[PDB]
Structure 1
Amino acid sequence: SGPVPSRARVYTDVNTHRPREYWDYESHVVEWGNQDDYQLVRKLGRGKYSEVFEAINITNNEKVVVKILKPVKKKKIKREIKILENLRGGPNIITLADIVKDPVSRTPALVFEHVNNTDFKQLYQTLTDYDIRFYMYEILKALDYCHSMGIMHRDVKPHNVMIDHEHRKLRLIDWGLAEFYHPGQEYNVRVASRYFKGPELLVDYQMYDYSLDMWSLGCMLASMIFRKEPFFHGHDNYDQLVRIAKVLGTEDLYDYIDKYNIELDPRFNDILGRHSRKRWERFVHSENQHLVSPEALDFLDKLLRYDHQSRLTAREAMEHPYFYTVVKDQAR
Structure 2
Amino acid sequence: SGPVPSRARVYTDVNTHRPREYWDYESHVVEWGNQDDYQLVRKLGRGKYSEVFEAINITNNEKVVVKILKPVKKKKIKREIKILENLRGGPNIITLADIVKDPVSRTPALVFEHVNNTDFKQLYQTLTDYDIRFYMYEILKALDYCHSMGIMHRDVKPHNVMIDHEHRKLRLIDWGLAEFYHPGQEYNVRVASRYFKGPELLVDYQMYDYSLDMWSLGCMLASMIFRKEPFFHGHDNYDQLVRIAKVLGTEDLYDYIDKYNIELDPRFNDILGRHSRKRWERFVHSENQHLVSPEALDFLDKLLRYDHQSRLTAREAMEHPYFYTVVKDQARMG
Shorter-chain TM-score range: over 0.9
- Aligned partner of 1:279 in structure 2 is 279
Following TM superposition, by how much is the alpha carbon of 1:210 offset from its aligned partner in structure 2, in angstroms?
0.2
Following TM superposition, by how much is the alpha carbon of 1:127 offset from its aligned partner in structure 2, in angstroms?
1.1
- Aligned partner of 1:72 in structure 2 is 72
Following TM superposition, by how much is the alpha carbon of 1:72 offset from its aligned partner in structure 2, in angstroms?
1.7
Contact (CA 8 Å) 2:223, 2:230: kept in 1 or not? Answer: yes
Matches of 1:268 and 1:181 in 2, distance apart? 29
Following TM superposition, by how much is the alpha carbon of 1:108 offset from its aligned partner in structure 2, in angstroms?
1.3
Contact (CA 8 Å) 1:31, 1:99: kept in 2 or not? Answer: yes
Matches of 1:116 and 1:25 in 2, distance apart? 31
Following TM superposition, by how much is the alpha carbon of 1:104 offset from its aligned partner in structure 2, in angstroms?
8.8
Following TM superposition, by how much is the alpha carbon of 1:124 offset from its aligned partner in structure 2, in angstroms?
2.4
Contact (CA 8 Å) 1:68, 1:102: kept in 2 or not? Answer: no
- Aligned partner of 1:28 in structure 2 is 28
Matches of 1:89 and 1:124 in 2, distance apart? 27
Which stretch of the first structure deviates more once superposed, 274-283 or 169-178? 274-283
Which stretch of the first structure deviates more once superposed, 248-257 or 121-130? 121-130
Matches of 1:121 and 1:266 in 2, distance apart? 37
- The DSSP-based 3-state class of the residue aligned with 1:66 is strand
Superposition pairs of residues 230-249 of structure 1, within 5 angstroms: 230-249=230-249
Matches of 1:148 and 1:288 in 2, distance apart? 34
Gapped regions of structure 1 (runs ≥ 5): none
Following TM superposition, by how much is the alpha carbon of 1:48 offset from its aligned partner in structure 2, in angstroms?
1.1
Which stretch of the first structure deviates more once superposed, 71-80 or 306-315? 71-80
- Aligned partner of 1:220 in structure 2 is 220
Contact (CA 8 Å) 1:94, 1:113: kept in 2 or not? Answer: yes
Following TM superposition, by how much is the alpha carbon of 1:70 offset from its aligned partner in structure 2, in angstroms?
1.7
- The DSSP-based 3-state class of the residue aligned with 1:63 is strand
Which stretch of the first structure deviates more once superposed, 66-75 or 135-144? 66-75
- The DSSP-based 3-state class of the residue aligned with 1:171 is strand
Matches of 2:271 and 2:147 in 1, distance apart? 35
Matches of 1:204 and 1:123 in 2, distance apart? 34
Which stretch of the first structure deviates more once superposed, 34-43 or 204-213? 34-43
Following TM superposition, by how much is the alpha carbon of 1:166 offset from its aligned partner in structure 2, in angstroms?
1.0
Matches of 1:43 and 1:105 in 2, distance apart? 21
1:87-124 CA distance string (max 9 Å, x none)? 00000000001111146964210000111113545522
Following TM superposition, by how much is the alpha carbon of 1:291 offset from its aligned partner in structure 2, in angstroms?
0.5
Matches of 1:45 and 1:192 in 2, distance apart? 19
1:139-195 CA distance string (max 9 Å, x none)? 000000000000000000000001111111100000000000000000000000000
Could you tell me the TM-score, scaled by structure 2's length? 0.97
Matches of 1:168 and 1:49 in 2, distance apart? 30
Matches of 2:231 and 2:11 in 1, distance apart? 29
Gapped regions of structure 2 (runs ≥ 5): none
Superposition pairs of residues 14-25 of structure 1, within 5 angstroms: 14-25=14-25
Following TM superposition, by how much is the alpha carbon of 1:35 offset from its aligned partner in structure 2, in angstroms?
0.7
Matches of 1:282 and 1:143 in 2, distance apart? 29
1:40-89 CA distance string (max 9 Å, x none)? 11111112121111111112222111001122211010000000000000
Among all aligned residue pairs of Structure 1 and Structure 2, give the percentage whose two residues are the same amino acid.
100
Could you tell me the TM-score, scaled by structure 1's length? 0.98
Matches of 1:122 and 1:110 in 2, distance apart? 27
Matches of 1:299 and 1:143 in 2, distance apart? 16
Matches of 1:289 and 1:252 in 2, distance apart? 27
Contact (CA 8 Å) 2:125, 2:227: kept in 1 or not? Answer: no
Superposition pairs of residues 167-316 of structure 1, within 5 angstroms: 167-316=167-316
Following TM superposition, by how much is the alpha carbon of 1:125 offset from its aligned partner in structure 2, in angstroms?
2.9
Matches of 1:125 and 1:112 in 2, distance apart? 27
Which stretch of the first structure deviates more once superposed, 174-183 or 62-71? 62-71
- The DSSP-based 3-state class of the residue aligned with 1:274 is coil
- The DSSP-based 3-state class of the residue aligned with 2:243 is helix
Following TM superposition, by how much is the alpha carbon of 1:27 offset from its aligned partner in structure 2, in angstroms?
1.3
Matches of 2:38 and 2:175 in 1, distance apart? 22
Following TM superposition, by how much is the alpha carbon of 1:254 offset from its aligned partner in structure 2, in angstroms?
0.6
Contact (CA 8 Å) 2:120, 2:159: kept in 1 or not? Answer: no
Matches of 1:236 and 1:102 in 2, distance apart? 39
Contact (CA 8 Å) 1:142, 1:172: kept in 2 or not? Answer: yes
- The DSSP-based 3-state class of the residue aligned with 1:143 is helix
Residues 23, 128 of structure 1: CA spacing in aligned structure 2 closer, same or farther, 3 A cutoff? same
Following TM superposition, by how much is the alpha carbon of 1:234 offset from its aligned partner in structure 2, in angstroms?
0.4
1:264-322 CA distance string (max 9 Å, x none)? 11221211111110011211111101001110000000000000000000000000010
- The DSSP-based 3-state class of the residue aligned with 2:43 is strand
Matches of 1:211 and 1:182 in 2, distance apart? 14
Which stretch of the first structure deviates more once superposed, 147-156 or 50-59? 50-59
Matches of 1:260 and 1:213 in 2, distance apart? 20
Contact (CA 8 Å) 1:129, 1:291: kept in 2 or not? Answer: yes
Contact (CA 8 Å) 2:232, 2:244: kept in 1 or not? Answer: yes
Q: Report how many aligned residue pairs link the two structures.
A: 332
